[PDB]
Ligand binder design. Structure first.
Ligand code: CLA
Ligand code: CLA
Ligand code: CLA
Ligand code: CLA
Ligand code: CLA
Ligand code: CLA
Ligand code: CLA
Ligand SMILES: CCCCCCCCCCCCCCCC(=O)OC[C@H](COP(=O)(O)OC[C@@H](O)CO)OC(=O)CCCCCCCCCCCCCCC
Ligand SMILES: CC1=C(/C=C/C(C)=C/C=C/C(C)=C/C=C/C=C(C)/C=C/C=C(C)/C=C/C2=C(C)CCCC2(C)C)C(C)(C)CCC1
Ligand SMILES: CC1=C(/C=C/C(C)=C/C=C/C(C)=C/C=C/C=C(C)/C=C/C=C(C)/C=C/C2=C(C)CCCC2(C)C)C(C)(C)CCC1
Ligand SMILES: CC1=C(C/C=C(\C)CCC[C@H](C)CCC[C@H](C)CCCC(C)C)C(=O)c2ccccc2C1=O
Ligand code: SF4
Ligand code: SF4
Lengths: 158, 741, 74, 132, 33, 137, 80
């Protein structure tokens, strides 16, 4: 839908390939959910990539502090298992959210039942989140790509 | 021209008629004394201008002239200090040999044998050793003669006279109108660009032209007699070019933009001067020049008469988000229509700033030969810490006063103040929880360590050789500050302070400053500090928020700012006013600052202050017993209080005997305060009734009937004596412990 | 030394007795509370009226005298 | 509905109001204006009738004093129990207690000076103090 | 003898106070008799 | 916008509908906890709570107890957890017998009794499971 | 609840009634005073014991007196 947040941009509504042109409300809601999940995950991924690149490593990961893709190996299988468990717990919470009648895509704060009235500033700030998230998605995929192709790694003239 | 000068000529007649009518200012006290309570009230409401007139203009004119009077008093105090330095001090002898000569600028008349207090400080001089660091300050200014101190005192006296005359003139002859006072933009521009901007610029000029060359000559070993007078450094440029061969170029680099040519005397080396043990004078000159530039720039931010500038009213109205309703709408009116609000902010900021000064001055000794003067460092730190605490609590009290008196709900609808008042319960409940959590955990660490050490289970304590609580974050910050020179501050040769890391700066075999390592004891004491600060904030914030109303007294505001109670109803309603919250907050602030001062003193004596050998070996005052003894309450009781109290108790028969006498007197006053703190007014009133019967039986009966102190006055007197006793006890303890050296 | 300490002890005994005797004799009423006997032996106060009346009951006299007893025995 | 415009605060009533007596205060405001809540910061009173809820009678009477001494408004106070009962409290007969009202009967009145009360020993072991 | 303290001190300092406080708590707020 | 509005649309109640107090996240998270979940017998609520709090409690005693450095640290920690659980079940029983005195919602004599029995069983289960897990790790 | 008693020394100035925050006191017609009115305490269940009435009394000794007694939710000043 054109009214939902994220639209404000130089491009305006950006749907070259028809995906929301005839999509039922369920499919558009799922598309927005995916966009927000990817965007937030990418924002965190870029921030973590910056943290690792700058040498900022936890005391428990002393040896590996140079290349994030290299650092990924240092994590034992059970560390990744616990990452997955935590993400699954949050996903279970969000699934419990979506059962509530008045759910809007990505509004895990229940803004509809919280705001005194729907506002334009709220839409603009949701758009800010979506835009920084889209940029973070592109930037994170680009970071991984540029570091895989050229092994020198960011901050090393990459 | 919206900003303009408005005054009333001959606002008040000058006469002594009022001086013979005490209590004239207040309507109630003007009727004369019926009982002794009147007397007390006359000294309690003297400066409560807001309660004497309903007009803001009159209160503003009184405040302005009272500030002039305070400036006159401060200038007289400075004049006295400088004059006692010039006529009654060994400043010249200390100049010649600063390390050995002990500063002293006070002499006692021999009248009852008190001349023993005239210590053998040195320099063929006898007097009371001073710990105000005035000698180091004067040396940093390149005084080098007592004529200059004498003229400094004369100028201070003339300035005190001018301040007194200005106060009289601006009350009784030309009193500015209210519209003149309500210029926040113009006032801020003038106080930033000129008072703080040009003040810094002028002091930087002084340092560049006077302090720098004189101190450089002194460090080279030139005797003060052979150092040319400071004015000689302003007439012949070459005479300064020898010291800093960049004047030869003159001021042309400054205007051409080639400021780099001034790096000779405008440096960024940081660290400490190895010779004097203080900060480099060139560093301070560059510092003050940069601050002058910044303050001058910041003084043009606000709009006064020409369109350009910032309107703080619009600025505040603009900042509002979803969570805070109307945002900062109505704060400008609050801060331009009530002196209590402004005083609260200013006192809080001044107190925090004083504490920051205390923390920064010890870590980076700014004056020559102040670092190795252990007595001066400790005195300055503790003095400014106490001043900061008092100012913070005063800011709290005046915030509460504003809330009770100058708060108007009509002009504060759904703004920040309204919302804070509307979730005060949540704020106070959470502050209470965090205070309890901090107290429990932090103090129970000490209790646990004490219990385990008493049970012989040393391996179960929270110590370095036991369960370890390392302040990892503080250590990481210290490491980053250590690595800053060359990487994050590339143009800084040395770290800001040697506390974080580096060499051991020692002057004359005394450790001026060395790195301070943080261990588990530091962790525990820091969390104790946080606990005490949080509790004090709890008390004062609760006093401020619940000053107008509460679930006990829905109409507390009508009762006033300070009142004893609202009767024994609803259970009991003792100490329910905001003034009583300030009364308790003063106790808690005193406790917290006592802990802070003990931490500083013991840590510096055990880990920083000491002596060095030609090889480089370090021997501290207490042998580094802080790590393994500061982790139990018994350790503090034994190794800090009992051990370091030897000097005071054994000071009898020496020049420090005055410190022992004051130690005992402070103990006495502290115990005396408990008489007012514990007891109530009814007992004393009945006792006074019996005593009055005794007087009457002999036809002795004052017309002014005696009365027991009011409840509020009883609490105030108890608190005042409690604070005086505690402060004096620690004052004597520290000064005698740090002057036996 | 024994002389001075004995006079200090006399001070302590006399002051504790002063507190306790004042409490006992004024228990039935004072000019501040002429009807004190009607409020019993132990009551908090009589309110902030007419100057304030904290620690006006006889129980409060005992409570105050306990501090002096401890001090003198010490 | 008739409640004054208020943004809400954490100082309102609590579980005892639901389980024990709650209080209500009604008044009439000629115009719309801001008044200080006994619990929160400030609230706007509607033109015409205003109804407000509280947990203590003292809060209601403090608000009533504010209205009377600032906005010269007459007011009424009621007590509501969980069972639904409503009792009229503050104006007991339509006239304030300060003003004399014929028909009232003295309560707790003693026909002698305060200093003539019996001694505690006289009334001993009976469930009574000297005043009773 | 030399065995009793082990048996009794835990009973007197843990079990006895625990049961005593339980019963006192029950009785204080019994709301009847 | 305005994310803070009176709770339940009642301005005169001592509460606020802040994002922490009344948001889909918190309502759904608390509404699925055993203490508030719908369609649970009080016995099951107690069992869930006990399982959560028993496994949770062995660790502190095991790792920070006086016998932490001995080869029997885990068993001592388990026994301490068991004793504390017994104390808490005593507390629960007395609270139930004092509060609700004159199967259903958890606020009843029988409901609370079933909740306490479930809590004891679940807490002992959690402690035993924590012991089993830590025994080989 | 607290016990509020009014003695015949009262001069019926109404100050005690005005000072009362819980509307415990009131004025009733009387003949033993010049003003023809006397204070009464018909509803002492709402008395909190603040003793404001005593503080606001002109008569030498407190024609209105308050004696604290059994405490209830109302007299204990509890919103809970
Ligand atoms: C897409 C998100 C994402 C993913 C998959 C990872 C994954 C990883 N991170 Mg990164 N990290 C992230 C976000 C992410 N991080 C963010 C947002 C921060 C900033 C707080 C960090 C800060 C960080 C540091 C400082 C370190 C890692 C490390 C690691 C590795 C071990 C896990 C760990 O210690 O986490 C640690 C997670 C946190 C400290 C906080 C997470 C906060 C969540 C997102 C909320 C693993 C490859 C460690 C490593 O192997 O060395 C490079 C390591 O030393 N990360
Ligand atoms: C402002 C700070 C300050 C302080 C704390 C001191 C403190 C001191 N000075 Mg310094 N002094 C100061 C400023 C100060 N002075 C200034 C500004 C000057 C320059 C004029 C001097 C010049 C100076 C000299 C030249 C000497 C001292 C000396 C002394 C010491 C003895 C003073 C004394 O009791 O003599 C006796 C003082 C009095 C008895 C005071 C007079 C009593 C008056 C009449 C009471 C009137 C009160 C009045 C009724 C109140 C109502 C107001 C009324 C007028 C209407 C003492 C340590 C002496 C010293 O150290 O000797 C070794 C000494 O020789 N001072
Ligand atoms: C308010 C502070 C202050 C004051 C009163 C002075 C005053 C003076 N300075 Mg100094 N100066 C200052 C700040 C100050 N300076 C600062 C902050 C710097 C650092 C950039 C300098 C750096 C400096 C140098 C390098 C030299 C002076 C010189 C001079 C003198 C000649 C002035 C001149 O020709 O300028 C013309 C007047 C205006 C532009 C107005 C004069 C006594 C010169 C000197 O010592 O010769 C006597 C000289 O060579 N000044
Ligand atoms: C840039 C020149 C300069 C120089 C050489 C110094 C030198 C010194 N400063 Mg100063 N200081 C400066 C600028 C400078 N300062 C500025 C601009 C500020 C304002 C924040 C301060 C605030 C400051 C404080 C609060 C304290 C010092 C202290 C010290 C001493 C500590 C020892 C040391 O190595 O300092 C090294 C100094 C630093 C590492 C501080 C550098 C600060 C940078 C330059 C901040 C720049 C802010 C930036 C311009 C913001 C612009 C915003 C605007 C455009 C909107 C030393 C004499 C201490 C002292 O004397 O205690 C006895 C002390 O407590 N300085
Ligand atoms: C900028 C500083 C400043 C200013 C201008 C004021 C101004 C004011 N304050 Mg604020 N206040 C301040 C700082 C300040 N205070 C601080 C730091 C605190 C914290 C303690 C307070 C705490 C405070 C409270 C709690 C109250 C005020 C009140 C007042 C008002 C009346 C003051 C008065 O009549 O003085 C009268 C002055 C005296 C009676 C002198 C007593 C001084 C002390 C007790 C003794 C000093 C001892 C001395 C230093 C050492 C003795 C040595 C010994 C051996 C003899 C006035 C508006 C009162 C008010 O109602 O205002 C509306 C009030 O209730 N203030
Ligand atoms: C040394 C005596 C002492 C002690 C221990 C306390 C303790 C406390 N005060 Mg008090 N206070 C004191 C003196 C003291 N105060 C004095 C002299 C004054 C006069 C000015 C005040 C005035 C005052 C005010 C005005 C306020 C406090 C507050 C507090 C609390 C701070 C939060 C905290 O630490 O909770 C944790 C509790 C402790 C650290 C106490 C020690 C407990 C240890 C660690 C464990 C004990 C063993 C354990 C319980 C074993 C249980 C079994 C056993 C029963 C058999 C706490 C209850 C504040 C408050 O209550 O709000 C938070 C507050 O607002 N106090
Ligand atoms: C008031 C007197 C008194 C006191 C203070 C103590 C104190 C103590 N006894 Mg001893 N004891 C006493 C009388 C007393 N005893 C008598 C008369 C007997 C003969 C039966 C014993 C036989 C005895 C044994 C066999 C042992 C102790 C032990 C102990 C210690 C641990 C407490 C314990 O386990 O109790 C156990 C005590 C009992 C089961 C009997 C009860 C003790 C007296 C009679 C109770 C008095 C109650 C008192 C009047 C107050 C009642 C109010 C109270 C409920 C608040 C402790 C030092 C233990 C020890 O030595 O540990 C190192 C231990 O093993 N006691
Ligand atoms: C500096 C303080 C840093 C912590 C601030 C926490 C976020 C604070 C924050 O982000 O606030 C921001 C939030 C948003 O307000 P708005 O952006 O709508 O307000 C616009 C402003 O310009 C004011 O009009 O304000 C509140 O909700 C205040 C009550 C906060 C309730 C949470 C309080 C938590 C306090 C305890 C946290 C302590 C953390 C460690 C402290 C060292
Ligand atoms: C300590 C004291 C004292 C003394 C002091 C002094 C003596 C001071 C001085 C001071 C000074 C002596 C200052 C000065 C200053 C100056 C300035 C501050 C300047 C400025 C300038 C400027 C700013 C400029 C500008 C410009 C120019 C250059 C020209 C061209 C253009 C322009 C305009 C831009 C006494 C003893 C009294 C007492 C106590 C206190
Ligand atoms: C994530 C996280 C978080 C949180 C967390 C938590 C809170 C956790 C918890 C956890 C827990 C709380 C866990 C638990 C577990 C439990 C379990 C696992 C249990 C089990 C049980 C069992 C197994 C049982 C069994 C049994 C029984 C029942 C009885 C007997 C028999 C048997 C043995 C069969 C947060 C977000 C804040 C932050 C970050 C991190
Ligand atoms: C001792 C005491 C009194 C009695 C104290 C009185 C009347 C003070 C007496 C002061 C004398 C008469 C002045 C002289 C005092 C010194 C000799 C020096 C002056 C000290 C300052 C006033 C400058 C109370 O009235 C009281 C009231 C409420 C709580 C506690 C107490 C309380 O503790
Ligand atoms: S004891 Fe004193 S402060 Fe407390 S209620 Fe009574 S008169 Fe008021
Ligand atoms: S205040 Fe005293 S004199 Fe006046 S009406 Fe009340 S009881 Fe009578």
């Amino acid at each position: 839908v054109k009214e939902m947040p994220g639209v404000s941009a130089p491009l305006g509504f950006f749907d070259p390939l028809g995906f929301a042109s005839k999509a039922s409300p369920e499919t558009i809601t799922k598309y927005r959910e995916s966009e927000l999940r990817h965007g937030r995950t990418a924002m965190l991924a870029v921030l973590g990539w910056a943290f690792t690149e700058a040498g900022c490593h936890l005391p428990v990961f002393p040896n590996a502090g140079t290349n994030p893709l290299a650092a990924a190996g240092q994590v034992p299988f059970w560390g990744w298992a616990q990452i997955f468990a935590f993400c699954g717990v949050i996903e279970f919470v969000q699934a419990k959210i979506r059962e509530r009648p008045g759910f809007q895509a990505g509004d895990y704060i229940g803004s509809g039942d919280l705001m005194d009235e729907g506002d334009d500033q709220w839409k603009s700030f949701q758009t800010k989140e979506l835009n920084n998230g889209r940029l973070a998605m592109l930037a994170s995929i680009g970071l991984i790509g540029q570091t895989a192709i050229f092994g020198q790694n960011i901050l090393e003239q990459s | 021209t919206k900003v303009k000068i408005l005054v009333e000529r001959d606002a008040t007649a000058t006469s002594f008629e009022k001086w013979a009518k005490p209590g004239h200012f207040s309507r109630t006290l003007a009727k004369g004394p019926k009982t002794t309570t009147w007397i007390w009230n006359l000294h309690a409401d003297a400066h409560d201008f807001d309660s004497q007139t309903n007009s803001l203009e009159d209160v503003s004119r009184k405040i302005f002239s009272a500030h002039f009077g305070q400036l006159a008093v401060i200038f007289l105090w400075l004049s006295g200090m400088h004059f006692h330095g010039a006529y009654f001090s060994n400043y010249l002898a200390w100049l010649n040999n600063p390390t050995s000569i002990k500063p002293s600028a006070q002499v006692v008349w021999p009248i009852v044998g008190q001349e023993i207090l005239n210590a053998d400080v040195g320099g063929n001089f006898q007097g009371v050793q001073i710990t105000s660091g005035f000698f180091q300050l004067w040396r940093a200014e390149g005084i080098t003669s007592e004529i200059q101190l004498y003229w400094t005192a004369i100028g201070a006296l003339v300035m005190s006279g001018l301040m007194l005359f200005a106060g009289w003139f601006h009350y009784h002859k030309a009193a500015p109108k209210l519209e003149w006072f309500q210029n926040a933009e113009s006032m801020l521009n003038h106080h930033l660009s000129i008072l703080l901007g040009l003040g810094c610029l002028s002091w930087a000029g002084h340092q560049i032209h006077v302090a720098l060359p004189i101190n450089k000559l002194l460090d080279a070993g030139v005797a003060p007699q052979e150092i040319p007078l400071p004015h000689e450094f302003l007439v012949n440029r070459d005479l300064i070019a020898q010291l800093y061969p960049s004047f030869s170029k003159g001021l042309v680099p400054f205007f051409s933009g080639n400021w780099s040519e001034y790096s000779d005397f405008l440096t960024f080396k940081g660290g400490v001067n190895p010779v004097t043990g203080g900060l480099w004078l060139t560093d301070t000159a560059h510092h003050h020049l940069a601050l002058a530039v910044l303050f001058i720039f910041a003084g043009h931010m606000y709009r006064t008469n020409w369109g350009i500038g910032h309107s703080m009213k619009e600025m505040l109205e603009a900042h509002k988000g979803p969570f805070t309703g109307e945002g900062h709408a109505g704060l400008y009116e609050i801060l331009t229509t009530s002196w209590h609000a402004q005083l609260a902010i200013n006192l809080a900021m001044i107190g925090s700033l004083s504490i920051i000064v205390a923390h920064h001055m010890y870590a980076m000794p700014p004056y020559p030969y102040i670092a190795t003067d252990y007595a001066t460092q400790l005195s300055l730190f503790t003095h400014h810490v106490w001043i900061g605490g008092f100012c913070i609590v005063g800011g709290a009290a005046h915030g509460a006063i504003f809330m009770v008196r100058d708060y108007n709900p009509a002009k504060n609808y759904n703004n920040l103040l309204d919302r804070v008042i509307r979730h005060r319960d949540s704020i106070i409940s959470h502050l209470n929880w965090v205070s309890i959590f901090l107290g429990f955990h932090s103090f129970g660490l000490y209790i646990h360590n004490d219990t385990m050490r008493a049970l012989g289970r040393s391996q179960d304590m929270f110590s370095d050789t036991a369960i370890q609580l390392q302040p990892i974050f503080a250590q990481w910050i210290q490491n980053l500050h250590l690595l800053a020179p060359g990487n994050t501050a590339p143009n800084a040769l040395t770290t800001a302070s040697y506390v974080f890391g580096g060499d051991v700066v020692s002057v004359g075999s005394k450790i001026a400053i060395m790195p301070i390592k943080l261990g588990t004891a530091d962790f525990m004491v820091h969390h104790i500090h946080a606990f005490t600060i949080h509790v004090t904030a709890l008390i004062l914030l609760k006093g401020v928020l619940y000053a107008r109303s509460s679930k006990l007294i829905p109409d507390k505001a009508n009762l006033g700012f300070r009142f004893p109670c609202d009767g024994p109803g609803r259970g009991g309603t003792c100490q329910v006013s905001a003034w009583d919250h300030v009364f308790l907050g003063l106790f808690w602030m005193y406790n917290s600052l006592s802990i802070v001062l003990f931490h500083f003193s013991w840590k510096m004596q055990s880990d920083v202050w000491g002596s060095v050998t030609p090889t480089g070996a370090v021997s501290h005052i207490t042998g580094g017993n802080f790590a393994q003894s500061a982790i139990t309450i018994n350790g503090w009781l034994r190794d800090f209080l009992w051990s370091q109290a030897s000097q005071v108790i054994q000071s009898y028969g020496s020049a420090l005997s005055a410190y022992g006498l004051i130690f005992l007197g402070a103990h006495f006053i502290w115990a005396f305060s408990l008489m007012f703190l514990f007891s109530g007014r009814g007992y004393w009133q009945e006792l006074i009734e019996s005593i009055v019967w005794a007087h009457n039986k002999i036809k002795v009966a004052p017309a002014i009937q005696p009365r027991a102190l009011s409840i509020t006055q009883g609490r105030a007197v108890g608190l005042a004596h409690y604070l005086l006793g505690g402060i004096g006890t620690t004052w004597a303890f520290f000064l005698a412990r740090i002057i036996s050296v | 030394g024994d002389f001075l300490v004995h006079h200090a002890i006399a001070l302590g005994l006399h002051t504790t007795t002063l507190i306790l005797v004042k409490g006992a004799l004024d228990a039935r009423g004072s000019k501040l509370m002429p009807d004190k006997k009607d409020f019993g032996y132990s009551f908090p106060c009589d309110g902030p009226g007419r100057g304030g009346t904290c620690d006006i009951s006889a129980w409060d006299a005992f409570y105050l005298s306990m501090f002096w007893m401890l001090n003198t025995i010490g | 509905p008739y409640s004054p415009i208020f943004g809400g605060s954490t100082g309102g009533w609590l579980r005892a109001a639901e389980v024990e007596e709650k209080y209500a205060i009604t008044w009439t405001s000629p115009k719309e204006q801001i008044f200080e809540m006994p619990t929160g910061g400030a609230a706007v009173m509607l033109i015409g009738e205003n109804l407000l809820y509280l947990a203590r009678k003292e809060q209601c009477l403090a608000l009533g004093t504010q209205l009377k001494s600032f906005k010269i408004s007459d007011y009424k106070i009621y007590r509501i129990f969980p069972s639904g009962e409503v009792q009229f409290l503050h104006p007991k007969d339509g006239v304030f207690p300060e003003k004399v009202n014929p028909g009232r009967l003295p309560v707790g009145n003693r026909s002698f000076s305060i200093g003539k009360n019996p001694n505690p020993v006289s009334v001993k072991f009976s469930g009574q103090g000297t005043y009773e | 003898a030399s065995y009793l303290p082990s048996i009794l001190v835990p009973l007197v300092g843990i079990v006895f106070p625990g049961v005593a406080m339980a019963l006192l708590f029950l009785y204080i707020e019994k709301d009847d008799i | 916008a305005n994310f803070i509005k009176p709770y339940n649309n009642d301005p005169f109640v001592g509460h606020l509908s802040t994002p922490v107090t009344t948001s889909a996240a918190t309502k759904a998270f608390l509404g699925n906890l055993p203490a508030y979940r719908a369609g649970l017998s009080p016995l099951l609520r107690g069992l869930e709570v006990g399982m959560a709090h028993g496994y949770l409690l062995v660790g502190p005693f095991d790792k920070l107890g006086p016998l932490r450095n001995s080869e029997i640290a885990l068993l001592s920690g388990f026994l301490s957890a068991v004793g504390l659980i017994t104390i808490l079940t005593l507390c629960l029983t007395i609270y139930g017998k004092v509060s609700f005195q004159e199967n259903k919602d958890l606020l009843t004599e029988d409901g609370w009794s079933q909740f306490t029995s479930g809590f004891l069983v679940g807490a002992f289960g959690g402690a035993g499971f924590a012991y089993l897990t830590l025994l080989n790790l | 609840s607290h016990a509020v008693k009014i003695y015949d020394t009262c001069i019926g100035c109404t100050q005690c009634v005005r000072a009362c925050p819980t509307d415990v006191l009131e004025m009733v017609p009387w003949d033993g005073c010049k003003a023809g009115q006397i204070a009464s305490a018909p509803r002492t269940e709402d008395c909190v014991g603040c003793k404001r009435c005593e503080s606001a009394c002109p008569t030498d000794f407190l024609s209105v007196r308050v004696y604290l007694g059994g405490e209830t939710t109302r007299s204990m000043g509890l919103a809970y």
